[PDB]
């Protein structure tokens, strides 16, 4: 839920808004494995579409987010 | 003949050549780059060289770095064209790909106006951009990615997507396309997938990828 909500703020910053409230928020199309890349779909009313991303740099497991 | 030396499957439909099967071309019209390879005539205008067709599983796409870089199979049959053959291709201008998908009398297609593979010391670094059609917009995720083999993994990968998904491909982590993933396989990621057509546990019956110059389309 805090992760949700920093997505969702995140989005917002990216589009600029001023962040209320998450209404709803589904994950969906990562493949199987632990850490794979996934997309977020944010109620907040507005439907935001976040990238959490993984990848190694220098065997550092790294996380990023991208606004779709 | 108009182009003696076609150097794609649009020369050689310009030739006069309309009836789909295996064609001479000969890279950059040098008579010493002889490349003989599938030429779909028939699909959205013609003058397409394939370079994958998947369709009933009898050739092995689990295949090392050398085997993608080189090409396989029977050209008529199912086969991968070659990393190289994309490479030295796509120089030659400017290329859109195409992918024709077909399952159980359900067909999709997908449309990119730019398609490009870099060369080897890029790893074929994959340049795909301008989607449209039916099939979704799988490539967008895979735009910029170097190739992967289970034999030669990426510095950036969380996983080996080659080894865990059964395939090779422009994998990040991992793919919405995996159309050489391994045929018939319903496992979760691990077949010949187009996640926004079928998703993850569908491997689809029939893929092909094939290219040709965008401004055919004029």
């Given at each position: 839920?805090?992760?949700?909500?920093?997505?969702?703020?995140?989005?917002?910053?990216?589009?600029?808004?001023?962040?209320?409230?998450?209404?709803?928020?589904?994950?969906?199309?990562?493949?199987?494995?632990?850490?794979?890349?996934?997309?977020?779909?944010?109620?907040?009313?507005?439907?935001?579409?976040?990238?959490?991303?993984?990848?190694?740099?220098?065997?550092?497991?790294?996380?990023?987010?991208?606004?779709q | 003949?108009?182009?003696?030396?076609?150097?794609?499957?649009?020369?050689?439909?310009?030739?006069?050549?309309?009836?789909?099967?295996?064609?001479?071309?000969?890279?950059?019209?040098?008579?010493?780059?002889?490349?003989?390879?599938?030429?779909?005539?028939?699909?959205?205008?013609?003058?397409?060289?394939?370079?994958?067709?998947?369709?009933?599983?009898?050739?092995?796409?689990?295949?090392?770095?050398?085997?993608?870089?080189?090409?396989?199979?029977?050209?008529?049959?199912?086969?991968?064209?070659?990393?190289?053959?994309l490479?030295?291709?796509t120089?030659?201008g400017q290329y859109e790909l195409r992918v024709?998908?077909?399952?159980?009398?359900?067909?999709?297609?997908a449309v990119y106006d730019k398609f490009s593979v870099g060369?080897?010391?890029?790893?074929?670094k994959l340049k795909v951009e301008g989607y449209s059609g039916?099939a979704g917009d799988s490539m967008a995720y895979h735009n910029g990615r170097?190739?992967?083999?289970?034999?030669?993994?990426?510095?950036?990968?969380?996983?080996?997507?080659?080894?865990?998904?059964?395939?090779?491909?422009w994998?990040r982590?991992?793919?919405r396309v995996?159309?050489?993933?391994?045929?018939?396989?319903?496992?979760?990621?691990?077949?010949?997938?187009?996640?926004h057509?079928?998703?993850?546990?569908?491997?689809?019956?029939?893929?092909?990828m094939?290219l040709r110059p965008s401004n055919?389309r004029?």
């Amino acid at each position: 839920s805090l992760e949700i909500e920093e997505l969702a703020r995140f989005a917002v910053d990216e589009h600029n808004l001023e962040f209320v409230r998450v209404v709803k928020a589904k994950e969906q199309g990562a493949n199987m494995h632990a850490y794979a890349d996934t997309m977020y779909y944010l109620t907040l009313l507005y439907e935001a579409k976040v990238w959490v991303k993984w990848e190694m740099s220098r065997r550092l497991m790294t996380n990023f987010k991208e606004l779709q | 003949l108009l182009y003696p030396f076609p150097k794609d499957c649009s020369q050689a439909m310009l030739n006069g050549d309309t009836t789909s099967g295996l064609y001479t071309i000969y890279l950059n019209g040098d008579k010493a780059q002889a490349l003989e390879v599938f030429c779909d005539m028939t699909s959205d205008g013609g003058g397409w060289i394939v370079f994958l067709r998947r369709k009933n599983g009898r050739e092995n796409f689990y295949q090392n770095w050398k085997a993608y870089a080189a090409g396989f199979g029977d050209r008529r049959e199912e086969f991968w064209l070659g990393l190289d053959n994309l490479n030295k291709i796509t120089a030659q201008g400017q290329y859109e790909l195409r992918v024709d998908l077909r399952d159980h009398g359900e067909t999709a297609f997908a449309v990119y106006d730019k398609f490009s593979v870099g060369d080897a010391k890029t790893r074929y670094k994959l340049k795909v951009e301008g989607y449209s059609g039916t099939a979704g917009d799988s490539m967008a995720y895979h735009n910029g990615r170097s190739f992967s083999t289970f034999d030669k993994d990426t510095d950036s990968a969380i996983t080996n997507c080659a080894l865990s998904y059964k395939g090779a491909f422009w994998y990040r982590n991992c793919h919405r396309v995996n159309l050489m993933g391994r045929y018939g396989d319903n496992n979760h990621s691990e077949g010949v997938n187009w996640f926004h057509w079928k998703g993850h546990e569908h491997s689809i019956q029939f893929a092909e990828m094939k290219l040709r110059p965008s401004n055919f389309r004029n």
